[PDB]
Structures are given as structure tokens and as C-alpha cells.
Amino acid sequence: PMIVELPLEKIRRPLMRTRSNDQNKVKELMDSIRQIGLQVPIDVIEVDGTYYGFSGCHRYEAHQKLGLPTIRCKIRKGTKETLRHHLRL
Template structure:
């Protein structure tokens, strides 16, 4: 089951480092500041911890705007699914 909720940015682990397009991050920062976050990021919830693999630009934009939380689509998953994402 997938649910959409606000999650504290500090609680999302991003195990795969990524280099973001800074122009895209700036454009998203402007959009989020004006009209709010329109599209949730996707996170896996494994053993009560959140892991993010997509939405990197939205994540960085929210971070740089000083937001405490981010809108996320949360999918509970077993550890085996997490290992497939990290492998």
C-alpha cells in the first residue's frame, strides 16, 4: 500500500549520491516557494526508516529552501527490496 505524507527531510536516507542539475534545482526552488511542492518524491519505508532514490532535485530544492518536511509517496517494503535498489 502506498500513502502520501509529509516526512522530515532529516529522516530520509539517500544511499546513492547524485550530482544534481543546479539550474533545475533553482527552478524547482522558485516553483516550490511560490506554489508549494506539486509532485511527491518516492520513498521506501524499510524497518521504520525512509530511503529515497528518486526526486533528487525536489529533495535538494526543499533542503535549500529550509523546509523541515517533504511530501512523499511512501511504499513499505522488506529489506530484500531495499537491497535490490542499492545493488
């Protein structure tokens, strides 16, 4: 697993419907990343040449509200089942 800087516009976020993000943690992470940068890269799954992200909601929102183009990611080659497992009620 190689850490890659992926643009924010390429990570599909299917769980944005459940975006109960506390702006306090978001702003704390914004300040910390603006200080020392992102330390824990988010988890991204590649399926059929498309990137999906289910964790790292606060970090993603912080990168968005900080005006940063890319974010560090640890990409895992995934299948249709691990993509379907995350999309199961």
C-alpha cells in the same frame, strides 16, 4: 498509499555519492516550490522503521536549499530485496 509530510532529516539518501545535480534544475524547482509548493510527492520506501529515498533528488535538494522542514512523500511498504535492488551496481 497515504501522502505524508516527512522531515528531511528522516529520509536516508544512500545515492548521495552520485549527486551530479544540475543547479539549474534545482533552482527552477526551488522557485516553483516557493511559488505553488511541491506537486509530485517523492517516493519513499519504509524498511524496519527507516525511510529510504532513491528518486526525487532535485526536489529533495530544492527542499534542503529552501529551508523547508518537511517534504511530501508517498510511502511504500518495502522489503529487504527492493532495498537491495536499488543498491545493486
